Amino acid sequence: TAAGISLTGGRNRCFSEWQSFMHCTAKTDAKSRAQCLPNFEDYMECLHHTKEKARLREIESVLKQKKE
Amino acid sequence: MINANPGFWNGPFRYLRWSAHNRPHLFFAFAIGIAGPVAALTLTPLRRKYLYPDHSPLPQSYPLPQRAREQLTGFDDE
Amino acid sequence: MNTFIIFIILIPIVRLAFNAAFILVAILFLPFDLEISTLLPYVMSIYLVSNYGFTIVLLFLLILIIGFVYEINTNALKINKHNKPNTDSLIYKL
Amino acid sequence: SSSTPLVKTSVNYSYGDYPLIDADPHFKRVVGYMRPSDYGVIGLATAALPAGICFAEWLDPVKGKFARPSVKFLRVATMLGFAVGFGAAYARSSLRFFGVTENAREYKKDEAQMAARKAAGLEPYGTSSLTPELQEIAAKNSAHSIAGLFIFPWFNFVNHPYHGREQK
Amino acid sequence: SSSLYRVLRNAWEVGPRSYWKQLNSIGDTKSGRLVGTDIYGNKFYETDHQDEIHLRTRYVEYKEKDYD
Amino acid sequence: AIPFEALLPYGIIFGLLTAGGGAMQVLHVYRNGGVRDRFAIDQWDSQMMERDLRLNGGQGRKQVDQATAPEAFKHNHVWKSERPLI
Amino acid sequence: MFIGTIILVLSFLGFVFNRRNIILAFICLETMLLGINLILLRNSVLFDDISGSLFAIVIIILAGVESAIGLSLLVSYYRLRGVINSYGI
Amino acid sequence: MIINIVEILIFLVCVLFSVAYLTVAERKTLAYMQRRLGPNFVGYYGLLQAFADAVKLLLKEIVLPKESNYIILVISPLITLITALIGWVVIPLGPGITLGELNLGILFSLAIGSLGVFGSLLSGWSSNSKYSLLGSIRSTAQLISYELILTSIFIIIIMFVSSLNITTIIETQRVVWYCIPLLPLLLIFFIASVAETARPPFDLTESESELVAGYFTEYSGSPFVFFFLAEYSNIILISAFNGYLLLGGYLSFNYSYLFNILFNDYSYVSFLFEGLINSSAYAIKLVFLMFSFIWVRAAFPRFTYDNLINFCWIILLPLLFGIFLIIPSTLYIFDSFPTLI
Amino acid sequence: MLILAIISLITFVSMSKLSDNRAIIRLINIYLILVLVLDSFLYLLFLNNQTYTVMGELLIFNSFTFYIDMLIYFIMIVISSLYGYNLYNNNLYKTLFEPKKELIILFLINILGALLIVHSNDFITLFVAIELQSYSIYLITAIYNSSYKASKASMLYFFMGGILSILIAYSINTYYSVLNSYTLHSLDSLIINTLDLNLILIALSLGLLFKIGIAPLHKWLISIYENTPILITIYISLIPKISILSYLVLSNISINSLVISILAILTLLVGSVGGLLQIKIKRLLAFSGLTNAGYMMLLLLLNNNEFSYLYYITQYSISHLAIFMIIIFSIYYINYINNQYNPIIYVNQLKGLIHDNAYLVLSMAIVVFSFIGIPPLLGFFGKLNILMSILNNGYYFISIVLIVASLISALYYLYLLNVSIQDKNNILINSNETVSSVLSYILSSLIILITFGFIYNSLIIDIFNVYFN
Amino acid sequence: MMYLTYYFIEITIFLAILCTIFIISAKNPMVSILYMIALFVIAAMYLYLIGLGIFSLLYIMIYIGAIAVLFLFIITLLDINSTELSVKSNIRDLPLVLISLIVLTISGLMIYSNDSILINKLLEAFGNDYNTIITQDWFNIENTTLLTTIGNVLLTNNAFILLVLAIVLLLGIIGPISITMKHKE
Numbered sequence A: 001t002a003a004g005i006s007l008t009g010g011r012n013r014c015f016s017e018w019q020s021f022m023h024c025t026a027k028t029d030a031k032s033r034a035q036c037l038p039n040f041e042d043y044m045e046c047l048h049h050t051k052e053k054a055r056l057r058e059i060e061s062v063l064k065q066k067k068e
Numbered sequence B: 001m002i003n004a005n006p007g008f009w010n011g012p013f014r015y016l017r018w019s020a021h022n023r024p025h026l027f028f029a030f031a032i033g034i035a036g037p038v039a040a041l042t043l044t045p046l047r048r049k050y051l052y053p054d055h056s057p058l059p060q061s062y063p064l065p066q067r068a069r070e071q072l073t074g075f076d077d078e
Numbered sequence C: 001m002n003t004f005i006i007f008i009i010l011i012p013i014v015r016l017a018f019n020a021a022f023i024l025v026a027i028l029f030l031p032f033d034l035e036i037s038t039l040l041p042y043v044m045s046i047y048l049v050s051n052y053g054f055t056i057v058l059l060f061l062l063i064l065i066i067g068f069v070y071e072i073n074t075n076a077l078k079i080n081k082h083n084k085p086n087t088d089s090l091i092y093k094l
Numbered sequence D: 001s002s003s004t005p006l007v008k009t010s011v012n013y014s015y016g017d018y019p020l021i022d023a024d025p026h027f028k029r030v031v032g033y034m035r036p037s038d039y040g041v042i043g044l045a046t047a048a049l050p051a052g053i054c055f056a057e058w059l060d061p062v063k064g065k066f067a068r069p070s071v072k073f074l075r076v077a078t079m080l081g082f083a084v085g086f087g088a089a090y091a092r093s094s095l096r097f098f099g100v101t102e103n104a105r106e107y108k109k110d111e112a113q114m115a116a117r118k119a120a121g122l123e124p125y126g127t128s129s130l131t132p133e134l135q136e137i138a139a140k141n142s143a144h145s146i147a148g149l150f151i152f153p154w155f156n157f158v159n160h161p162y163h164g165r166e167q168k
Numbered sequence E: 001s002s003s004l005y006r007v008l009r010n011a012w013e014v015g016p017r018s019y020w021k022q023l024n025s026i027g028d029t030k031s032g033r034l035v036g037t038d039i040y041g042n043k044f045y046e047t048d049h050q051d052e053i054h055l056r057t058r059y060v061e062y063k064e065k066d067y068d
Numbered sequence F: 001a002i003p004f005e006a007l008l009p010y011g012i013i014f015g016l017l018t019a020g021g022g023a024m025q026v027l028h029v030y031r032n033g034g035v036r037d038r039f040a041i042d043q044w045d046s047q048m049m050e051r052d053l054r055l056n057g058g059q060g061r062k063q064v065d066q067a068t069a070p071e072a073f074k075h076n077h078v079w080k081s082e083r084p085l086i
Numbered sequence G: 001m002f003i004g005t006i007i008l009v010l011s012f013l014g015f016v017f018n019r020r021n022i023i024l025a026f027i028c029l030e031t032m033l034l035g036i037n038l039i040l041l042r043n044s045v046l047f048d049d050i051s052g053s054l055f056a057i058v059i060i061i062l063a064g065v066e067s068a069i070g071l072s073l074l075v076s077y078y079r080l081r082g083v084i085n086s087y088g089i
Numbered sequence H: 001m002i003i004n005i006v007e008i009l010i011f012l013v014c015v016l017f018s019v020a021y022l023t024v025a026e027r028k029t030l031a032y033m034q035r036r037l038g039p040n041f042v043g044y045y046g047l048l049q050a051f052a053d054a055v056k057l058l059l060k061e062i063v064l065p066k067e068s069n070y071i072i073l074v075i076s077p078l079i080t081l082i083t084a085l086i087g088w089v090v091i092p093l094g095p096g097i098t099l100g101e102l103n104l105g106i107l108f109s110l111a112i113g114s115l116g117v118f119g120s121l122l123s124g125w126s127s128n129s130k131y132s133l134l135g136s137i138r139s140t141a142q143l144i145s146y147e148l149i150l151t152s153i154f155i156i157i158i159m160f161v162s163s164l165n166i167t168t169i170i171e172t173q174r175v176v177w178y179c180i181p182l183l184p185l186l187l188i189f190f191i192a193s194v195a196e197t198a199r200p201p202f203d204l205t206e207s208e209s210e211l212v213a214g215y216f217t218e219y220s221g222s223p224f225v226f227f228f229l230a231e232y233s234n235i236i237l238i239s240a241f242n243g244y245l246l247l248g249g250y251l252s253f254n255y256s257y258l259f260n261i262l263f264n265d266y267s268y269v270s271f272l273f274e275g276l277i278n279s280s281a282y283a284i285k286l287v288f289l290m291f292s293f294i295w296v297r298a299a300f301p302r303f304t305y306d307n308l309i310n311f312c313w314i315i316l317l318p319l320l321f322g323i324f325l326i327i328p329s330t331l332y333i334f335d336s337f338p339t340l341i
Numbered sequence I: 001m002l003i004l005a006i007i008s009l010i011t012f013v014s015m016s017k018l019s020d021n022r023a024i025i026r027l028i029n030i031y032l033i034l035v036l037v038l039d040s041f042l043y044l045l046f047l048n049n050q051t052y053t054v055m056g057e058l059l060i061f062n063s064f065t066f067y068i069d070m071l072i073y074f075i076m077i078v079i080s081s082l083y084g085y086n087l088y089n090n091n092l093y094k095t096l097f098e099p100k101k102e103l104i105i106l107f108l109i110n111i112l113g114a115l116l117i118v119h120s121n122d123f124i125t126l127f128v129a130i131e132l133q134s135y136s137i138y139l140i141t142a143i144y145n146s147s148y149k150a151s152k153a154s155m156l157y158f159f160m161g162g163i164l165s166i167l168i169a170y171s172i173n174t175y176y177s178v179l180n181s182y183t184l185h186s187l188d189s190l191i192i193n194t195l196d197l198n199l200i201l202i203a204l205s206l207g208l209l210f211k212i213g214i215a216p217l218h219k220w221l222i223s224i225y226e227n228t229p230i231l232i233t234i235y236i237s238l239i240p241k242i243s244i245l246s247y248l249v250l251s252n253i254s255i256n257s258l259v260i261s262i263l264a265i266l267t268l269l270v271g272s273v274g275g276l277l278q279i280k281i282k283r284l285l286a287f288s289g290l291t292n293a294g295y296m297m298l299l300l301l302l303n304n305n306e307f308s309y310l311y312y313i314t315q316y317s318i319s320h321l322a323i324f325m326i327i328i329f330s331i332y333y334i335n336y337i338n339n340q341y342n343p344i345i346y347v348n349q350l351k352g353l354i355h356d357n358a359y360l361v362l363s364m365a366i367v368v369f370s371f372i373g374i375p376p377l378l379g380f381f382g383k384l385n386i387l388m389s390i391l392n393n394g395y396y397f398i399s400i401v402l403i404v405a406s407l408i409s410a411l412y413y414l415y416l417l418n419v420s421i422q423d424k425n426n427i428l429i430n431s432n433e434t435v436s437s438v439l440s441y442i443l444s445s446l447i448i449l450i451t452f453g454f455i456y457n458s459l460i461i462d463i464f465n466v467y468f469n
Numbered sequence J: 001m002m003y004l005t006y007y008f009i010e011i012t013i014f015l016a017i018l019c020t021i022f023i024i025s026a027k028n029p030m031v032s033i034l035y036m037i038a039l040f041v042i043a044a045m046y047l048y049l050i051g052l053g054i055f056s057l058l059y060i061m062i063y064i065g066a067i068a069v070l071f072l073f074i075i076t077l078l079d080i081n082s083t084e085l086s087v088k089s090n091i092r093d094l095p096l097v098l099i100s101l102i103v104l105t106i107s108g109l110m111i112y113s114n115d116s117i118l119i120n121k122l123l124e125a126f127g128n129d130y131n132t133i134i135t136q137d138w139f140n141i142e143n144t145t146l147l148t149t150i151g152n153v154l155l156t157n158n159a160f161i162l163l164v165l166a167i168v169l170l171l172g173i174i175g176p177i178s179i180t181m182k183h184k185e
């Protein structure tokens, strides 16, 4: 009811991926709902930033041991 | 006692005179509080018809046009 | 270092009985304070909630006026005296 | 000032066996379309509540002896009984609109009301003081609130365009 | 009278030296004729102005800084 | 007003706060570089003041009417790297 | 996310292992609510969302009313007993 | 950050010296109302009395009773002064001529006027004796009961202008001061201000405890001095709230035509003469209202705690919860809801 | 209708003395009856399980919630008649059962908080409503402040209910931290499988369930139901359990939890075992409410659990009212009054009640055998449906524990009946005073429904196969 | 200069730990309430650090301004006895205190993540290593702040919760009266 609203009264940071996921839920029934996996994973990545964080941990490892 | 309550259901107007005389601090508070919602209900359409209408709303955001894109030119590179 | 930031640091560092109206006044200060503080968002969003959130806050205030009405007519905050002046009548059996 | 919907809705959803008129009817239409059955139900509850406490005082009096209840309770009784009766009648009419009950007379009256308004150029369901986003918020708050009549009353007063009919 | 015109006219009447002396001794400015001086050297004055209420017509100007 | 002795301390208070307000005005003005102080600034106005600091050489509230920017403007762009919140 | 969890845990432990009085229990409840609001507001910032701050303001209201009701209940206990002893409820 | 230091020291000197001479102004104003004079012997017309009362109290013993606390009787006056002083930061003497210049200045003042109560709360705990702990309770119930009424006025006027910036609230008063459409709120705000400072005719506890062996502020030495620089500053502060909320603050006659006639350019003279005029309007307003605190003190007798709590919760609050309904209605009738700027 | 009741009563009660409290209770009783009669046609909207979202997406209205609303009102028109119709017009029964002024307001506010819970669709409405239901019920325990035990009770219930509101809010804020949502409709098979939310949702279930006495935190609520007055115990013991269990049943949170299986087993064992040595009535009936909470917990694990829940919650509520009503009527025929608030405490005080009023004991037997699950009483057809659902979904060890718990609970249920049909010296032979008419008719009507409502089971099944399917 | 204000959040964390231990250990409860006020202040500080001074001020004018005034208003009037912290009475809880601390902390930290392996759920919580970029856009046109947004949604989208909080506050009025005030007449 107050979902998708920011602190300035506008669209949040991760709204767009939520919109794509909700679109693809409306497109699909519970059997075909598996198609909504990558959209949901994109949403979770925007929220919690895990895969990008691990990417940067790999970069930092290369800057850390392979140089010293 | 000297100036006790005569009861709202045993004469409204007589109760209202008693209250204005002995309990103004409630009576004029009720009158204030009732004068807002009631006037908002009653006088607003008169003001909208005769004095002036209601203002056109403010933009609030970029007014994205409801159309399809058009091919333009001018101001291109070179 | 801002002048507010410079100032907001400098200044500090350079058995018995009671009547229950004494306690009700504090206990009731809470909800009325929360009412008047919850009214802040309305006054700062009053335009954007034009004529809808107006009516909403009025029903809010009226509901709160009900509880105030209950408080007044109970006479909670009044202090009550025990050593009453006699008002019986003087009657002599004959 | 545009009165053009921001959000899609259903077109002619069937809440019952009979066709639809409105899904968020304004308080005015609900009160103007009331059948006499509704006003009789108003007076039934208006008389049945104070009569109920008199019936009860006859059955188990408050003291040892029957005495008719004081006019104080009877007045409060009549007020609440009118409130119950109006809530029932506001519901009975609203359900004639949703398509849950027989709605022949209400179908024809709306078809007449709407054609006359289109003839006069007026917007069907009317023009509002509000921005369209608040119109949509109002319809979302107020739609099908009569289902909560046991808990709270809620009523539409906004003249939004999100009623559940085809665009024309 | 407690008005400013009083002190201004008085300071015009009696000179600034007497003004600073009166300010350092009495706390008020006062101007009036001399009536005489005693054996200790203390001078005694009298006023006639309308502005001066009862019990403020006659005043003293002590000689010693440690007046008593 | 008759009782000047009673109004003198009010004259002290009046003159002290008066000179305090005028002196603070000149100090804020000298801080800003010859312009009255801003107030009630929001996100936009701050972001634009930062853009001014990018176009002038960091000279505060100095404005520039040139239709075309110096080439440093394209490379003076700042992003802001924030600490993780815990 | 850290500070809120820490105040919450320590205040739950001081609520549970209080053999002394009751005002500590009231205080630990209020601190638990505080830590919750801090958790939630941190998440609301990181997501740039408003539902968190809405639930936070609602918690503030409800917690103040909680303390009001609790401190009337204590006053009832005291009415009857006259002393709130260390190990009484 | 040098001029920031200059600006702080100017402000602190001006405010503290204003407090010191508000003591003398209180006494001489009250005297001439009583057909006497003075202090007019400790200086050139008494302009050094306040510093004499201070220096006497700083060379006075720091004596602590046997069954008392030390730390509470010491820090509590100190924290009272601090909390009362930081409210001065958000107070403008020109358009943006403010040390804070926050966008939440109203809410800062309102939260700090809520922190103020703790001085009276901790005073009663400085005396383990039993009656003082009830006398502080009387004096706390007056403050927390009257802060509801001061706040409610902050909200009523912010319905007119939808911003918590103090300068913005004052700049909207170019058109009209908010004491003209809401004149009764001027009385109410001034009454409640006099109450929150526990000033006469609302000085119940200091008098009720001056008779009794305790239940008052039986301090000595430096804590006396801080409590008397925190009372006479909370007075100016609450008078300032009246000023920038209802009386136009720094506003005055439009000095457009004059400055146009006399200057021709924006120099470092016009800025000075402008800031002088603005602050002078703000100052004379504070002077008239400090006079009014004294004027009230000289006349009216005292209240009792029952009359006082009854005055608040049964007479004032109903009128305000009425005004909460009439003003939004008055805006809705005429299509005049203010914008966020 | 509740709101206009609560609003009107505040004014009308402040205007009214202590002497009108019974008539005002009678008024709101009749008003609730007029609601339940005249607005009941709204069940048509929920044809073919048409479900509606209201006030945005905060509330949800389906046939489940509507029936729960009618039940809470039927409970609240019977619980009010107990305060507004005096049993006997004697001085003793005036002093024993006299309503207070603010009681009825707190009842209706607790009705409101109960209904906002079941109707909730977002966690924010749940948190606001559970706080409303919780705060109202702190005060209801405490309103009889002239008793020491109730004062102790409200204080403990405040603290141990506050702790659980903390647990609930901690769970909600975690769900929001993970998913950026306060709505459970934002779940589905994808999001359940894809995300580790098992811990984050069982913490919700437990924080709600420990507020209803689920084991091993049963004792505090049992001490409360024992220590509070009987006519308050009959309300606090029921309505909070209906509300929270209905919210957890409607939202299919814990489909196949292992923790819930363990705790529900422990409740059936505790509530069956620990209630055997009890000599007091209220503790006995509280342990009974616990084992029934165990049975109803066992259908949080099913995903198709509406009929079994609705039938059991209805017969439980009916039997629960009726048995407490029998205990209230029997106070006339005992010899010793223990208190002004709890006139009857020990089960051995009902001795010989058959020789005084036998048809009161017939009602007690019908109600007891209904609790046990003896057909053709309604309790059989309720525990049968639970057995059908759990065996249809794959819980076998739990069905055996269920059978075993029913047998063990027969003993503390039959203690009442055994002492009641015992013999007694100094019997009653005549009494010119007479119990009220209304309370007798209410008790009778509940008895006749427990007895003969098996006749309508097919009709109920047909209506369910339309409006819930 | 830059990094003088880098560890303020860790400082507030350490200070909140201290104030909790002090609330638990203090002799006279009045001191424990003062430490609770210190804790609410530290929370208000932290909220300013993360960009929510509005809630800092609402806390200072709600919690401290009313709730703690009331807590002192109670303990000033009631005879709340105590039992000073000891070793004979409270040491027995040390094993359970420690077990409860470790488990509750590690669970409260693992709970916030969606990884399937347990140890990684905590090692994700301990991954606070990387900085968050802040970009500047130009789409926000108004001067809407958090309080204005709260008013908009609370009074439009979530009106029902407001019109229920009114009834919560009615309870806050009406329950305490019924409990304290004996309507003998």
Ligand SMILES: CCCCCCCCCCCCCCCCCC(=O)OC[C@H](COP(=O)(O)OCCN)OC(=O)CCCCCCCCCCCCCCCCC
Pocket: G008, G009, G012, G032, I163, I164, I166, I167, I168, I170, I198, I199, I200, I202, I203, I206, I256, I257, I258, I259, I260, J099, J102, J103, J104, J106, J107, J108, J110, J111, J118
């Ligand atoms: C409210 C008062 C305020 C204080 C609050 C304190 C913080 C609260 C902590 C969290 C909330 C409390 C939770 C209450 C316990 C119930 C938790 C639960 O039941 O979740 C279980 C759930 C799986 O259960 P289920 O879904 O039913 O079955 C499917 C299984 N695949 O999900 C799970 O599988 C659980 C995940 C397994 C990992 C659990 C984490 C334990 C880690 C602790 C390690 C300790 C180290 C070793 C010992 C140290 C001692 C020296």
Ligand SMILES: CCCCCCCCCCCC(=O)OC[C@H](COP(=O)(O)OCC[N+](C)(C)C)OC(=O)CCCCCCCCCCC
Pocket: I040, I041, I043, I063, I067, I070, I071, I074, I307, I310, I311, I314, I315, I449, I453, I456, I460, I463, I464, I467
């Ligand atoms: C409802 C008031 C409950 C208060 C307690 C009184 C019991 C009334 C039961 C009627 C239920 C119904 O008739 O409904 C059947 C419901 C669904 O139908 P519905 O959507 O709710 O429409 C009903 C529309 N009414 C209200 C206008 C009628 O199926 C169920 O799962 C209900 C299981 C209940 C089992 C209890 C049986 C008790 C025997 C009743 C003998 C008269």
